[PDB]
Symmetry: C3
Subunit: 497 residues, 3 copies
């Protein structure tokens, strides 16, 4: 029989066709989805995880191959001469870097294989000399000459740059649960943080002064999932950054007394430490887990933060501000616990629409409520009630912590990720629960047997989800057995983590 596309075609007078043939499809109505070319993904879900081939740039050790049309073995100077014409800005950047200009070097004492690096570090030194065997580097290259910074970059725990891709892309439910082309940006954002040294001081200038600015962090550290850029920007610190950025001296090292206005790097890469996670009190899954950072057991961490603030403030003032965070965070969890009780209550009474068996299976292949143990908390392919629940804990409750940590008066109270947004979300959740309960009570009284709509279970997008494909023995548990990396507590991990 006719598909949606077939019917649309008959009404609009545009033939059905493949999405990728170049036709301009009116409202995309008569286009058929085609699977892009994929490569196999890595990690514990390698049996079905895919990536677009462009993963070559971000996990080059496992995916990089020669794809150049230019042949020859060249000297550094020859790289520069041709690329001056062919990719001019790369050469301009490099000429303005310490690698390509001795005049701006600071005599740091850089060594390779125990010997001082006194020459230019040219294109060929990083990419190789043979244009048919060019190399696309990771931090492994930089380690040859910058071992201190690399060791620190590799010193973080789960939730740090160190494992952002290897663990928190390849094991993450929201990534593995979706078609590869939908989440390319997830792989790359997290992979840039882990595998590269250019997330903060970009190629090819590699300028530490650039890395000190909030712009070195905010492309990644933003949004409803983790809104720390907005929290910082809407603090007095952030306003002063905007006011002073144009005329302040960004060439000064991150040190006590060198800056009036603190930035992300100042507070988190203290004294140039390339393991920024380590200053945090404790990893809390972005504030979705509740912890009082002002409790006696965390005194050393709290005192360390107070001393950091004391670069520019009374320590009594700083202590008071961090206590406001503790108090505000603890109040915020009362609203989440209210939400959770309402939501789980609906599931236990069997009034959620759809119920889990009425939806597509989750990415484990289970028909399991998303906000119970063993489920997959999410915002997609689930009930409205479960969506709103996820929004409450992740987008709002987590960000209340971020608002307090960064001194955003407005976002603690009124704004995005605030107390008052929590209030409004709680009203939304209760509203959904109330509607569900009223429908169920009416249907019971009149003897109407409600069946959840088929659109909760099947559709052009829902039919693409990996939950449909899951089968016994499709998990690489040897990956989860690894002890050289941490792991996520996934329901199908199959082993101790």
């Amino acid at each position: 029989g006719p598909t949606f596309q077939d019917v649309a075609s008959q009404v609009f007078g545009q033939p059905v066709g493949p999405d990728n043939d170049g036709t301009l499809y009116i409202f995309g109505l008569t286009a058929k989805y085609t699977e892009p070319e994929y490569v196999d993904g890595r990690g514990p879900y390698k049996s079905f995880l895919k990536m677009l081939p462009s993963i070559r740039w971000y996990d080059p050790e496992h995916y990089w191959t020669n794809g150049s049309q230019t042949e020859g073995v060249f000297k550094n100077e020859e790289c520069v001469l041709c690329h001056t014409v062919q990719t001019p800005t790369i050469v301009n950047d490099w000429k303005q870097s310490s690698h390509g200009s001795k005049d701006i070097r600071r005599g740091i004492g850089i060594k390779k294989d125990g010997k001082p690096v006194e020459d230019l570090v040219g294109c060929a030194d990083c990419h190789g000399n043979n244009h048919q065997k060019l190399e696309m580097p990771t931090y492994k290259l930089c380690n040859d000459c910058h071992p201190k910074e690399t060791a620190e970059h590799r010193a973080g725990g789960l939730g740090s740059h160190t494992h952002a891709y290897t663990v928190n892309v390849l094991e993450f439910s929201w990534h593995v649960g979706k078609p590869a082309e939908e989440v390319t940006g997830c792989a790359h954002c997290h992979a840039i943080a882990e595998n590269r040294c250019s997330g903060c001081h970009t190629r090819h200038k590699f300028d530490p002064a650039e890395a000190r600015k909030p712009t070195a962090c905010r492309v990644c550290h933003m949004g409803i999932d983790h809104d720390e850029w907005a929290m910082y920007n809407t603090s007095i610190h952030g306003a002063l950054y905007e006011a002073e950025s144009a005329r302040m001296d960004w060439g000064k090292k991150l040190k006590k007394g060198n800056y009036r206005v603190p930035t992300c790097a100042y507070c988190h890469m203290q004294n140039g430490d390339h393991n920024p996670q380590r200053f945090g009190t404790i990893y809390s899954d972005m504030g979705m887990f509740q912890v009082d950072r002002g409790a006696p057991k965390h005194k050393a961490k709290r005192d360390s933060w107070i001393k950091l603030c004391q670069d520019c403030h009374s320590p009594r003032f700083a202590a008071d501000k961090l206590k406001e965070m503790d108090a505000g965070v603890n109040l915020s969890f009362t609203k989440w616990r209210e939400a959770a009780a309402v939501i789980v209550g609906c599931y236990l009474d069997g009034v959620v629409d759809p119920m889990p068996e009425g939806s597509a299976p989750d990415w484990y292949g289970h028909y399991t409520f998303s906000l119970l143990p063993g489920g997959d908390p999410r915002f997609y392919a689930t009930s409205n009630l479960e969506r709103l629940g996820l929004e409450m804990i992740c987008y709002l409750t987590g960000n209340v912590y971020k608002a307090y940590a960064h001194m955003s008066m407005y976002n603690q109270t009124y704004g995005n990720g605030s107390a008052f947004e929590q209030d409004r979300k709680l009203v939304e959740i209760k509203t959904e629960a109330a509607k569900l309960r009223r429908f169920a009570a009416i249907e019971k009284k009149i003897g109407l047997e409600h069946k959840s709509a088929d659109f909760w279970k099947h559709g052009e997008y829902l039919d693409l989800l990996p939950g449909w494909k899951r089968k016994p023995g499709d998990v690489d548990v040897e990956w989860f057995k690894r002890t050289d990396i941490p792991h996520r507590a996934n329901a199908d991990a199959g082993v101790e983590i």
Copy 2:
């Protein structure tokens, strides 16, 4: 009987009165709406379209009249002497422009009527010498001395600056469908782009260095309708713009090798081309129409973009990034097609509340479903289901394209106009559909004849809409017959377009 205002008056003790009399109305409850003074609008709907008189500044050829109290015929120097006192910044701007200062001229070779312009171009040269017959210019004036830039500015197709007002204000459903004072900003934003030469390099400095900055575009190129500023700003390019803006040389022409960080103008006004639309692969109604820009038939356009990126990147890298766009866009349309099926399904089963006959007529004067052929897709004066549908296609699906085109990792996936926002909107749409279906099933079983509420059809705002006033013969179809401008495919156009 008493109106809302009358009842409110009796409860609050504030008399009913006209909104425009200067009274401070408590929550605006007892104020009566008054129609502002209008002038007639232009275009195919001129029989009922209105504008506020302030349209004089933006379509001066058709609306400008003398409104000055100052009399005299003056020389350029006299304009300057008096306006130094009367409008100081205009004079300061002009004195800092090439028009008013020979010292900053570049010897471009500007001519008027075949003769070199060697004098100052003063207030009177652009506005006239008689203060009771002052002129308010458009690009027609600038063409006298800058024919190349003007020709390019006038070379675009539908969806470009060239027809932004003449076609895409005067023929646009959302503009013609609303009271004039509600949409003044629409007329002016679109009219500034079309009729003026000051949208990017503002009067009275007319500084190209200003026009090269993203600030020259983002006042217009923003928001949930078309969020390209945010997409750019949340890319690494955008972060580098913020980092480098204060110290970079904006005086350099937009040319390969002159910039490290690309801006809107760099990529879209390539080499100073004043027809920025022409570099686009194809006009797609802001990404609401699906097209694979990586398909064989679009190879020339794709290769041109790759070469643009190659100013600062490997062309293989650029090609991969643009393929990610193609793939991400194609996946995004699966969710829209799901949404559309759910929404139209509800209409075909007769369970939408209100149904079209329960709402105010659309701007054509029809009681027609908004998301069917011949309807008016919209976010106002319609059902919640239809609102959510419009939000899905315009605000979200269109912006997924914008997120990929501009390399915003976060907004492709998590953020505003992203895949995950599409997911959440799809849950909202299914939720509305499910509620509608459950109500209809209950009402059928118990024999309750539901009538949609009167507030869907009538109210103080809804009663102002032009749909109520539409009648046969009220369209100027001669306008649509014009072949010197393109046209929108409006349901009542009455002729071939």
Copy 3:
């Protein structure tokens, strides 16, 4: 029986415990809320209002106490020597201020007790000489040497910096209605504006050039409650600020002809006036009250604004722009009045779910509809219908005024706080009303007696609200009797205001 925490504990294997003991609680599920240490709040609700002890910094006259561990009586030079080590940036700021550096003084003629201040104004001059009796100042200190600026800062009416905390924190429903730690940022934002002189030109540099920038206002003047920063930033003025900030001369006094680009301070602190409220036509509760500022009775104010704009524009142009504001504002109230009729209609027909007696009492201790006289308009602890109503009047209708006042073409029409957001909110409100009415009609026909869910009335957060604690005689009406400050028209004020 088991609480939510007890049940969660049994399912997750984490013991129940107090939120403040430092345990990392999985999704905060097994943590019990503990009341933070409070101090008593001031104002008419002092019988139950609380503050966190950190209020010491913001209302120091009533809460400041010695909390230093350092003992001694010191000379100014000694303060500097030690704090160079102990709080370096404070000293660096002070050394770069006129107080601490004669070289940057302008010979203003500053006097204390009728005598010229010719020495440095050091740490001890502002904080005292005894480290166990240090002072935390307000504007009262600054008045000793800057009486003109202080008098103006203290000259505003309700809705100005002058009474931001004393009246609009201590008397405000949303503040007094919530646990103290939830609204700390409210107290501090409003208290910084009232009690300090560092909101715009921050300590310890106290630089007027900093205060002239929009960054001096936007930390407070932002968001869905009052979005003037975004309105300004998305105007051409705001784009030009961003374009010119890095290279423009911010050292010039706010005067006609000194600036190309107007900022908040330029337009509102005209010629350096420290009572910025006074230039407004009339206080309108942030545009929630409707007034036509172009009406004959407001001509003097309108003419004054036109003349301000004429620093850089034709006064005819300016007049037209302010008339667009008047017209756009008046149209916006038609949609609010529609919303209000729908919402109140539902209450009068008894179909709101919950009805007021089904919710927790409001902060007065009443079970009263929030959008009727005597009620408490709010977004929390109320029905979805009432939430949406508050969002319509405060977040949207109020901000339409802000969008027009600040020349944001996009936000007048499409964007945040716009006409089209009003449209969408109106659809949401009608949708809620329609659902409520359909449920009520079904339940009546089948004889089902609906009881609103218990979660509308009780829960871990709702149980903390002050409405439960209210009792006769708990209002300090002597506060409301004061005539030296204005007051809010609270339902339980008990006296004439």
